[PDB]
Design a binder for these strands. Structure first.
Ligand SMILES: [Mg+2]
Ligand SMILES: [Mg+2]
Ligand SMILES: [Mg+2]
Ligand SMILES: [Mg+2]
Ligand SMILES: [Mg+2]
Ligand SMILES: [Mg+2]
Ligand SMILES: [Mg+2]
Ligand SMILES: [Mg+2]
Ligand SMILES: [Mg+2]
Ligand SMILES: [Mg+2]
Ligand SMILES: [Mg+2]
Ligand SMILES: [Mg+2]
Ligand SMILES: [Mg+2]
Ligand SMILES: [Mg+2]
Ligand SMILES: [Mg+2]
Ligand SMILES: [Mg+2]
Ligand SMILES: [Mg+2]
Ligand SMILES: [Mg+2]
Ligand SMILES: [Mg+2]
Ligand SMILES: [Mg+2]
Ligand SMILES: [Mg+2]
Ligand SMILES: [Mg+2]
Ligand SMILES: [Mg+2]
Ligand SMILES: [Mg+2]
Ligand SMILES: [Mg+2]
Ligand SMILES: [Mg+2]
Ligand SMILES: [Mg+2]
Ligand SMILES: [Mg+2]
Ligand SMILES: [Mg+2]
Ligand SMILES: [Zn+2]
Lengths: 108, 304, 152, 115, 102
RNA sequence: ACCUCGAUGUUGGAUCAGGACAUCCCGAUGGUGCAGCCGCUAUUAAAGGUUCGUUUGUUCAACGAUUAAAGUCCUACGUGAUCUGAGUUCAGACCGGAGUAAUCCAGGUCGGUUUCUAUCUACUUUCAAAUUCCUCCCUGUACGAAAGGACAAGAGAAAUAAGGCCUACUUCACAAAGCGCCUUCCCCCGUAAAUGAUAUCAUCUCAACUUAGUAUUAUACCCACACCCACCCAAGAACAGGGUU
RNA sequence: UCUCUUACUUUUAACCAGUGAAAUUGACCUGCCCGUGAAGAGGCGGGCAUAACACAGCAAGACGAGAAGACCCUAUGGAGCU
RNA sequence: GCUACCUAAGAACAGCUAAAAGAGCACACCCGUCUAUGUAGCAAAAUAGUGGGAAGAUUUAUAGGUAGAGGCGACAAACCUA
């Protein structure tokens, strides 16, 4: 089934400039209090999450280094310690992960 | 910017606010338990030709029911939940044939309602209701707004009409929508199994209005006429109606007296305006049965 | 019509769906925090809690062991489930996992979600937090709460 | 449910039913406005190369709860006038026939067992 | 035996005689019956040899003598499973191993 | 004022049907060579309905079993950008006949490819009014010499159609379905009669008029409107809708 | 296969992101009924209807689109065979 | 260099039954019966299933030959670079 006639620019404009076709303005956008970058509500802030993910990756690299090879998951809990930190009574009997940097403010 | 009620509330403020609003709703509902103690609208005796208000009930589900003759009838359970009279309109004001009562059912959140509706309910002093339905009544059947309605409004042996939105099947083809026979499976039939055949005639260069074509089926109001009331449970406000009513379970149905000409003037024995429990003349039992209904707790029936 | 259908259709079919979820769950047990498409994460979440329940049911239990053997492709994780994850949650009766929506994926613009087991060693997520009690609206309502409790 | 071209077991004393034949008796027609035949529905058979009326007495298809369901589709041969061809019915016969509209007294009389 | 309280079999001289007897008893029944009592149907009107009327507690069979002899309803109801005509009937047998012979 | 056989988007079927009345059935009447049951004939009526199978012989034909009846037609075969036999109709092949042959038949038989992603018009829950059969009563009555055998009114059972539903049963299993269950409401206008003039009788009246007569049916359904973060849903392609105390 | 169809899965689908064809197209501000035009009308006459725009279905019309046909006829046009 | 046929020198054919074969079942291999899909396609002839043959008038690689008034043909007017 082929078009019987060429559709005009007038009719085409009516189709493609319809509100239905148009991009809708978003009202979800707020400033993240932590970093000041824009976040959509209901969604984790991209900047803050990227920061957390970078740190998580570093810790995981260290975890892999200590484990050595595959199929070496520990049968005890894990704890991450930074520079100038010692294991506590709770941290005793846990796997210790050492980081070469200082504690982040957000990490508690 | 978009806002919801608990957007700006603290961790400890959310439970407090929830409790506060819930308690106020409970209080408002409890306030309206005695309409006769409050200044009522005049109660008139039943007359031929008169029509009384109906109810809004929730479809609980279905169970079997037996009769003394031995026949099994399936029944639908309709629970009456926070059913109140909301509004009265005179015939002149409505610009219609009859006076109207707006009646609401099934209380819902205040936070999820529009300001207009909230204001209306505030003036009433009742928590907002999910659905409001309009009942055409005579003048002598007028009830003061705020008056609660109960399942005992209906009585066993009475016939009712039930109206609800049917279960929405979404977009359906002709076979499920209109019961078109379709085309055979094998013996050719390249791409024709479930298709509509010839839509119209050759001579007309068009398709008639109201031709049966694929589209959205369900999710529309339908009325089931002449359903018998087998049983009332006064404690839980349950109406046992014969057969199946439209809609899914946990939906809201509009229940009124049967419009069928056979059951035109059988409203004589029924409580005319409504049933007022606070009247307290011959306090009704937990269960009201029809004569034919095999009551639970009765001895095993023998066909003598 | 799909009234009351509780499971998504994903992968190459029913078996494939199980296998996809199994891989996500194995990832979660190992890493304790997993990024994946939102729908897949939401589907897997239920299985995550159920697995902890079977973990709690006991190491010695043969039924729980069989389940754990199936759902964990890497076998080293099976001790971890029984000896680390299950003892961690012994106090609480549920809500073991935490799921949060993540900015859409770069390539395919897919809705994304992070899922973690609660009480993990990893750096805490930037979780959404309700407004402070010291805000103006919260102060007004605290006043109201005080007045109500004084009335009683 | 007995339709046209349904093989049928004759539960009767009649010579026509019980005599050996190469093919089983087959339903030619059902005397109901819809093709479907149930208990108490008169049908027409092709039996032993002749057309003969029969009455259905139980079938494989489930019905109302308390009503019995039979493993085989069972018929009783009847003449055009309505009297049974065979003298005795050994196979148990449902009691629902009595209340049903039609000439069921003859069949119940010649029946020996009820289920 | 869950059929009736009383089973009645009578003999008639002619078809016309059978009809006369069957119609009279139903006419007498209608006169004497209660309003709650359901109406009865004369069965086998077209049949020239057998008529039967079913009441609440009674079944009446009106049949010609030659018809009565072959059917022997008297024998069947007195002797439910011990009837002579039941003895000649042999139950069908499925061949063993589910393989037919000859 | 010769024997032909033509035609061939020609015609079947499926799907969905729109319409006409010149009515096949169901409604109401008049006549009868209408005692009653069946009929024959005409008037009015298109709301609803109008079956499943199979070809030994039959020039647009039957046969079997039914039915209330198995209507006659128009719609570009109604309808092939929804589908499908056969024929026109052929590329291969054989039989009978014709022709020296190639080849032909206005004869027979076997085998045999039409694709389409919808631009425009039109349309995509008008709805809320259902018909029919059988059984019983009347009644075995009226009627009739018998044989036979009603109509009104009422009751019960079904089938179909329209609209729903899932308690059971069945396909199955947070649910969707039928093979299951539930509900289904008004009439039709042709005539049959009073009183009574033109035409002091009579006369049902394209006289004024009076009844059967019902007229415009009617009633039912729907009907308030945050934020339009998000989540859930018995709501849904998207969108929209319902719930979030 | 059918009576008589149903349920589920996959593909497709629809929505979001990326890439991005083809046949087709006189111009179109592109309605319905009846009539006219030997049939046949969106556009002509007499009536009627009618804020405007998407998206998803449909195949009644646009003698819907592309070739390739089959039929009849014509050319002092060809060719193969006898 | 496709294809029809031929020439030279080659290669391939599991397993099972068989007095033992242009035998049977049945792989690989060759072909293309029937259906469905596809129809600007994966494809200017394909896919999936189902099929016919599969020690032979078999299938197939290499090199050579026959040329249009012609070749070649287990005649289908077949094939001779869509
Ligand atoms: Mg079908
Ligand atoms: Mg197909
Ligand atoms: Mg095709
Ligand atoms: Mg869903
Ligand atoms: Mg997928
Ligand atoms: Mg012509
Ligand atoms: Mg029609
Ligand atoms: Mg007429
Ligand atoms: Mg025609
Ligand atoms: Mg067409
Ligand atoms: Mg072939
Ligand atoms: Mg909403
Ligand atoms: Mg599409
Ligand atoms: Mg796109
Ligand atoms: Mg182009
Ligand atoms: Mg026209
Ligand atoms: Mg015009
Ligand atoms: Mg469109
Ligand atoms: Mg035009
Ligand atoms: Mg020339
Ligand atoms: Mg020349
Ligand atoms: Mg050689
Ligand atoms: Mg070999
Ligand atoms: Mg061989
Ligand atoms: Mg072989
Ligand atoms: Mg060759
Ligand atoms: Mg040849
Ligand atoms: Mg040739
Ligand atoms: Mg070439
Ligand atoms: Zn941030």
């Amino acid at each position: 089934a082929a078009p019987k006639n060429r559709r005009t620019i007038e009719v085409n404009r009516c189709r493609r400039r319809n509100p239905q076709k148009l991009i809708k303005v978003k009202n979800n956008i707020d400033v993240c209090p932590e970093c000041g970058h824009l976040k959509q509500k209901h969604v984790l802030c991209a900047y803050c999450y990227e920061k957390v993910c970078k740190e998580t990756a570093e810790i995981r690299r260290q975890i892999g280094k200590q484990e050595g090879g595959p199929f070496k998951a520990p049968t005890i809990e894990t704890v991450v310690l930074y520079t100038g930190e010692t294991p506590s009574e709770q941290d005793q009997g846990k796997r210790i992960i050492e980081r070469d940097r200082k504690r982040p403010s957000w990490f508690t | 910017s978009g806002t919801w009620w608990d957007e700006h509330l603290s961790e400890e403020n959310v439970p407090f606010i929830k409790q506060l609003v819930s308690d106020e709703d409970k209080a408002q509902l409890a306030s309206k338990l005695c309409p006769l103690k409050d200044e009522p609208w005049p109660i008139h005796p039943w007359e031929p030709g008169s029509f009384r208000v109906g109810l809004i009930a929730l479809k609980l589900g279905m169970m079997p029911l037996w009769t003394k003759d031995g026949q099994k009838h399936v029944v639908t359970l309709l629970q009456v939940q926070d059913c109140h009279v909301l509004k009265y309109t005179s015939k002149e004001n409505c610009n219609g044939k009859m006076a109207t009562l707006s009646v609401g059912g099934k209380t819902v959140s205040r936070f999820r309602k529009a300001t207009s509706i909230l204001e209306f309910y505030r003036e009433l002093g009742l928590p907002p209701k999910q659905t409001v339905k309009i009942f055409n009544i005579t003048d002598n059947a007028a009830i003061k707004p705020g008056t609660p309605l109960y399942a005992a409004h209906f009585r066993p042996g009475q016939y009712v009409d039930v109206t609800a939105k049917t279960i929405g099947k979404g977009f359906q083809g002709v076979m499920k929508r209109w019961g078109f026979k379709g085309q055979p499976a094998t013996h050719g039939q390249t791409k024709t199994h479930r298709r509509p055949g010839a839509v119209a005639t050759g001579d007309i260069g068009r398709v008639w209005p109201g031709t049966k074509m694929p589209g959205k089926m369900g999710n529309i109001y339908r009325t089931e006429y002449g359903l018998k009331v087998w049983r009332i449970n006064t404690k839980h406000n349950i109406i046992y109606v014969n057969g199946s009513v439209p809609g899914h379970k946990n939906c809201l149905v509009k229940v009124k007296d049967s419009k069928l000409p056979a059951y035109k003037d059988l409203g004589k024995n029924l409580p005319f305006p409504t049933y007022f429990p606070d009247g307290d003349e011959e306090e009704l039992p937990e269960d009201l049965y029809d004569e034919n209904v095999c009551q639970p707790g009765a001895p095993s029936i023998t066909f003598a | 019509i799909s009234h009351g259908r509780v499971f998504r259709r994903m992968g190459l079919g029913p078996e494939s769906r199980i296998h996809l979820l199994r891989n996500l769950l194995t990832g979660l047990v190992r890493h304790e925090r997993i990024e994946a498409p939102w729908a897949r994460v939401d589907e897997m979440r239920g299985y995550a809690e159920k697995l902890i329940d079977y973990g709690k049911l006991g190491d010695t239990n043969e039924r729980a062991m069989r389940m754990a053997d199936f759902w964990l492709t890497e076998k080293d994780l099976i001790p971890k489930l029984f000896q680390v994850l299950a003892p961690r949650y012994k106090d609480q009766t549920g809500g073991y996992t935490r799921m949060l929506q993540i900015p859409n994926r770069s390539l395919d613009r897919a809705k994304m979600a992070v899922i973690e087991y609660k009480g993990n060693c990893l750096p805490p997520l930037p979780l959404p937090r309700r407004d402070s009690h010291l805000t103006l609206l919260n102060q007004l309502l605290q006043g109201l709460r005080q007045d109500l409790r004084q009335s009683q | 449910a007995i339709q046209k071209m349904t093989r049928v077991r004759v539960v009767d004393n009649s010579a026509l039913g019980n005599s050996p034949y190469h093919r089983a008796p087959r339903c030619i027609h059902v005397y109901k406005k819809n093709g479907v035949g149930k208990v108490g529905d008169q049908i027409l058979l092709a039996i032993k190369g002749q057309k003969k009326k029969a009455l259905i007495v139980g079938h494989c298809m489930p019905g109302p709860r308390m009503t019995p369901r039979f493993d085989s589709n069972n018929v009783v041969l009847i003449e055009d006038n309505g009297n049974p061809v065979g003298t005795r019915i050994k196979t148990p016969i449902p009691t629902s026939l009595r209340k049903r509209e039609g000439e069921y007294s003859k069949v119940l009389a010649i029946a020996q067992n009820f289920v | 035996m869950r059929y009736t309280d009383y089973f009645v079999i009578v003999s008639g001289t002619s078809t016309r005689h059978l009809h006369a007897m069957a119609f009279y008893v139903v006419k007498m029944y209608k006169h004497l019956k209660c309003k709650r009592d359901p109406h009865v149907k004369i069965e086998g009107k077209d049949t020239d040899d057998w008529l039967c009327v079913d009441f609440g507690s009674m079944v009446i069979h009106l049949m010609l003598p030659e018809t009565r002899e072959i059917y022997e309803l008297e024998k069947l109801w007195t002797l439910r499973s011990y009837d002579d005509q039941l003895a000649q009937i042999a139950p069908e047998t499925v061949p063993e191993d589910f393989i037919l012979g000859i």
